Amino acid sequence: ERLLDELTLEGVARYMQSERCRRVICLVGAGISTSAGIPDFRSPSTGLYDNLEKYHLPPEAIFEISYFKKHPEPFFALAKELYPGQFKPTICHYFMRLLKDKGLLLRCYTQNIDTLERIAGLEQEDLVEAHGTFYTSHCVSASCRHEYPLSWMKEKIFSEVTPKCEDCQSLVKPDIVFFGESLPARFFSCMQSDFLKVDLLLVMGTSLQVQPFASLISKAPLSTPRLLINKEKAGQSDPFLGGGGMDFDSKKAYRDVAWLGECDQGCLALAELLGWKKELEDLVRREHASIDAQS
């Protein structure tokens, strides 16, 4: 006997509204922000890195910290080119805000750097930004580390002035984790505590191909149901590489459910099952109108 009465979205919703389900961890990737216009920065099939010759570069050096600290100009020129015209979180982001409102959100682990989780109303304590964030920036000198807000960094990016610390004139870097940098200590300390406590893993908009983030699904207790909302099935064991892997379809499947489609539409469907459609619609329309009215 398993926790889901059937391996479907309808089964998951019944489980969430049972007393057995109290603490939900969300694992989210670039798929939850493409609807807001944010490209997948890890995908070479998004045309982001087609115009890098102008930067007279050696490709991956654009995001390697060693290269950045010596030649920061290419990164900041790219950042200007790609800076979003607007920061409007998606239906998926506000669904997690509703999970928070209803006392169900234990933690959201995000691969994204775009700050939309914070704009949607998740708080720092709710979030593990596994790859950092553009939300804040810091001087890179170890004896300084002066912090700067996005408004300050934005103004440097758009005026094409390489950002420098006002106290010490070292370079100032967005708090994203470049290649070559340590991953955040908070990612590991939170994982060791949260996965002792999780009742449901909600995995949305990630293909689960980037480590160590993808290994989080194997940290769940064996009984914990795992729902994937994503355009493509993901997280199954690799027939070549072979283990915590997802099992949606075998005769041994017992807890993993795949809902295949756009993340906004899957979150809409789950909310409707939960009785939350009107609440979710009202929240999105209100926050979107507010952002659109920013003067």
Binding site: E60, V177, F179, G180, E181, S182, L183, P212
Partner: peptide, 7 residues
């Protein structure tokens, strides 16, 4: 602490 690598 582990460093960030491709993939």
């Amino acid at each position: 602490l582990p460093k960030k690598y491709g993939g």
